[PDB]
Design an enzyme around this catalytic site. Structure first.
Site, PDB file in Angstrom:
ATOM      1  N   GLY A  47       4.400  28.650  22.604  1.00  0.00           N
ATOM      2  CA  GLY A  47       3.804  27.336  22.343  1.00  0.00           C
ATOM      3  C   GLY A  47       3.937  26.912  20.903  1.00  0.00           C
ATOM      4  O   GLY A  47       4.224  27.737  20.033  1.00  0.00           O
ATOM      5  N   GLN A  52       1.801  22.580  13.006  1.00  0.00           N
ATOM      6  CA  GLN A  52       2.418  23.822  12.528  1.00  0.00           C
ATOM      7  C   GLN A  52       3.800  23.636  11.817  1.00  0.00           C
ATOM      8  O   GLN A  52       4.303  24.554  11.119  1.00  0.00           O
ATOM      9  CB  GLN A  52       2.607  24.824  13.641  1.00  0.00           C
ATOM     10  CG  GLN A  52       1.325  25.394  14.226  1.00  0.00           C
ATOM     11  CD  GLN A  52       1.598  26.402  15.318  1.00  0.00           C
ATOM     12  OE1 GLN A  52       1.806  26.055  16.487  1.00  0.00           O
ATOM     13  NE2 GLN A  52       1.552  27.665  14.950  1.00  0.00           N
ATOM     14  N   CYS A  92      -0.061  34.334  16.755  1.00  0.00           N
ATOM     15  CA  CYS A  92       0.287  32.973  16.395  1.00  0.00           C
ATOM     16  C   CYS A  92       1.438  33.051  15.394  1.00  0.00           C
ATOM     17  O   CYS A  92       1.476  33.894  14.465  1.00  0.00           O
ATOM     18  CB  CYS A  92      -0.944  32.266  15.819  1.00  0.00           C
ATOM     19  SG  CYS A  92      -0.805  30.543  15.325  1.00  0.00           S
ATOM     20  N   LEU A  93       2.359  32.115  15.576  1.00  0.00           N
ATOM     21  CA  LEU A  93       3.487  31.928  14.687  1.00  0.00           C
ATOM     22  C   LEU A  93       3.037  31.708  13.264  1.00  0.00           C
ATOM     23  O   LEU A  93       3.673  32.220  12.351  1.00  0.00           O
ATOM     24  CB  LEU A  93       4.338  30.741  15.170  1.00  0.00           C
ATOM     25  CG  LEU A  93       4.868  31.007  16.602  1.00  0.00           C
ATOM     26  CD1 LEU A  93       5.419  29.764  17.251  1.00  0.00           C
ATOM     27  CD2 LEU A  93       5.909  32.120  16.579  1.00  0.00           C
ATOM     28  N   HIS A 134      -5.377  27.587  23.035  1.00  0.00           N
ATOM     29  CA  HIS A 134      -4.832  27.966  21.752  1.00  0.00           C
ATOM     30  C   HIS A 134      -4.134  26.795  21.054  1.00  0.00           C
ATOM     31  O   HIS A 134      -4.400  26.524  19.856  1.00  0.00           O
ATOM     32  CB  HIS A 134      -3.848  29.144  21.958  1.00  0.00           C
ATOM     33  CG  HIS A 134      -3.238  29.657  20.693  1.00  0.00           C
ATOM     34  ND1 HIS A 134      -3.639  30.849  20.096  1.00  0.00           N
ATOM     35  CD2 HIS A 134      -2.185  29.195  19.960  1.00  0.00           C
ATOM     36  CE1 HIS A 134      -2.874  31.076  19.034  1.00  0.00           C
ATOM     37  NE2 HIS A 134      -1.981  30.093  18.937  1.00  0.00           N
ATOM     38  N   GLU A 135      -3.235  26.108  21.771  1.00  0.00           N
ATOM     39  CA  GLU A 135      -2.474  25.007  21.206  1.00  0.00           C
ATOM     40  C   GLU A 135      -3.320  23.837  20.843  1.00  0.00           C
ATOM     41  O   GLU A 135      -3.126  23.266  19.766  1.00  0.00           O
ATOM     42  CB  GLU A 135      -1.374  24.511  22.135  1.00  0.00           C
ATOM     43  CG  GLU A 135      -0.232  25.474  22.386  1.00  0.00           C
ATOM     44  CD  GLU A 135       0.364  26.058  21.120  1.00  0.00           C
ATOM     45  OE1 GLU A 135       0.446  25.352  20.043  1.00  0.00           O
ATOM     46  OE2 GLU A 135       0.705  27.262  21.230  1.00  0.00           O
ATOM     47  N   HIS A 138      -5.119  24.086  17.445  1.00  0.00           N
ATOM     48  CA  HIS A 138      -4.330  23.581  16.299  1.00  0.00           C
ATOM     49  C   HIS A 138      -4.553  22.094  15.947  1.00  0.00           C
ATOM     50  O   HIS A 138      -4.514  21.708  14.782  1.00  0.00           O
ATOM     51  CB  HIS A 138      -2.838  23.822  16.477  1.00  0.00           C
ATOM     52  CG  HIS A 138      -2.439  25.253  16.354  1.00  0.00           C
ATOM     53  ND1 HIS A 138      -2.404  25.899  15.133  1.00  0.00           N
ATOM     54  CD2 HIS A 138      -1.957  26.136  17.267  1.00  0.00           C
ATOM     55  CE1 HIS A 138      -1.980  27.143  15.313  1.00  0.00           C
ATOM     56  NE2 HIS A 138      -1.710  27.315  16.597  1.00  0.00           N
TER      57      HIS A 138
HETATM   58  C1  LIG Z   1      -1.420  33.523  24.302  1.00  0.00           C
HETATM   59  C2  LIG Z   1      -1.764  33.053  22.918  1.00  0.00           C
HETATM   60  C3  LIG Z   1      -1.029  31.752  22.674  1.00  0.00           C
HETATM   61  C4  LIG Z   1       0.262  32.093  21.976  1.00  0.00           C
HETATM   62  C5  LIG Z   1       0.910  30.914  21.278  1.00  0.00           C
HETATM   63  C6  LIG Z   1       1.761  31.444  20.104  1.00  0.00           C
HETATM   64  C7  LIG Z   1       2.698  30.402  19.530  1.00  0.00           C
HETATM   65  C8  LIG Z   1       2.022  29.515  18.509  1.00  0.00           C
HETATM   66  O1  LIG Z   1       2.240  29.602  17.310  1.00  0.00           O
HETATM   67  N1  LIG Z   1       1.252  28.573  19.050  1.00  0.00           N
HETATM   68  O2  LIG Z   1       0.826  27.517  18.318  1.00  0.00           O
HETATM   69  C9  LIG Z   1       2.661  32.548  20.586  1.00  0.00           C
HETATM   70  O3  LIG Z   1       3.672  32.289  21.214  1.00  0.00           O
HETATM   71  N2  LIG Z   1       2.263  33.775  20.331  1.00  0.00           N
HETATM   72  C10 LIG Z   1       2.914  34.937  20.889  1.00  0.00           C
HETATM   73  C11 LIG Z   1       1.850  35.668  21.706  1.00  0.00           C
HETATM   74  O4  LIG Z   1       0.672  35.601  21.347  1.00  0.00           O
HETATM   75  N3  LIG Z   1       2.206  36.328  22.829  1.00  0.00           N
HETATM   76  C12 LIG Z   1       3.543  36.786  23.259  1.00  0.00           C
HETATM   77  C13 LIG Z   1       3.504  36.580  24.767  1.00  0.00           C
HETATM   78  C14 LIG Z   1       2.027  36.520  25.144  1.00  0.00           C
HETATM   79  C15 LIG Z   1       1.208  36.673  23.864  1.00  0.00           C
HETATM   80  C16 LIG Z   1       0.714  38.125  23.700  1.00  0.00           C
HETATM   81  O5  LIG Z   1      -0.053  38.318  22.499  1.00  0.00           O
HETATM   82  C17 LIG Z   1       3.672  35.703  19.769  1.00  0.00           C
HETATM   83  C18 LIG Z   1       3.824  34.933  18.445  1.00  0.00           C
HETATM   84  C19 LIG Z   1       3.068  37.057  19.454  1.00  0.00           C
HETATM   85 NI    NI Z   2      -0.828  29.396  17.145  1.00  0.00          NI
END
Ligand SMILES: CCCCC[C@H](CC(=O)NO)C(=O)N[C@H](C(=O)N1CCC[C@H]1CO)C(C)C
Ligand code: NI
Length: 160
Positions: A47, A52, A92-93, A134-135, A138
């Site tokens: 997401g 961001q 989070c990114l 989560h999104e 932001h």
């Molecule tokens: C589920 C929480 C919402 C995640 C959204 C974030 C992306 C982001 O920056 N959103 O603004 C992401 O992809 N995060 C990933 C993430 O949190 N993941 C990877 C797949 C599922 C989850 C596991 O922690 C990565 C960066 C680690």
């Molecule tokens: Ni995030």
């Protein structure tokens, strides 16, 4: 590709402005959207929210191949469907190298607009509801650490 802002940048802290009706359907919006998907795909995200990458707009994208459909959501409103809360791991990114357990609503309704101005109205659960929440956070200047209540579960990815 755009640069992902990191935690501590004041632009991740602002309340975002709605997408004006003027931009719905527009080329300009579409190009922002393409740029977002290109950024998110490059860094592996599920997401991404407009603030961001420094664009002050209520706009989010998400999806991945727990399957979640690719989705572009403008001007959102979230309504919890009951009191049930669930803990899950987030990262989070904007917060590279960390993970934390966060308690979110299990079931929500979300509504807003698609990029052409068509209404969106969906009720979802579990991972899909977690991603939206989560999104949308932001857009109101909230990152996941500000939502943690069990700090025993917050830590560096490479340690956890
Ligand atoms: C589920 C929480 C919402 C995640 C959204 C974030 C992306 C982001 O920056 N959103 O603004 C992401 O992809 N995060 C990933 C993430 O949190 N993941 C990877 C797949 C599922 C989850 C596991 O922690 C990565 C960066 C680690
Ligand atoms: Ni995030």
């Amino acid at each position: 590709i755009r640069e992902i802002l990191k935690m501590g940048d004041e632009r991740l802290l602002r309340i975002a402005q709605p997408v004006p009706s003027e931009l719905l359907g527009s080329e300009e919006l579409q190009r922002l959207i393409d740029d977002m998907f290109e950024t998110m795909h490059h860094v592996g995200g599920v997401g991404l929210a407009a603030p961001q990458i420094g664009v002050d707009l209520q706009l989010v994208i998400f999806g991945f191949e727990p399957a979640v459909p690719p989705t572009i959501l403008l001007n959102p409103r979230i309504t919890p469907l009951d009191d049930e809360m669930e803990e899950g791991w987030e990262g989070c990114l904007s917060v590279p190298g960390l993970r934390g357990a966060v308690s979110r609503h299990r079931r929500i309704r979300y509504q807003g607009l698609d990029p052409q101005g068509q209404p969106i109205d969906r009720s979802v659960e579990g991972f899909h509801a977690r991603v939206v929440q989560h999104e949308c956070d932001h857009l109101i200047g909230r990152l996941y650490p500000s939502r943690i209540t069990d700090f025993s579960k917050f830590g560096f990815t490479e340690v956890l």
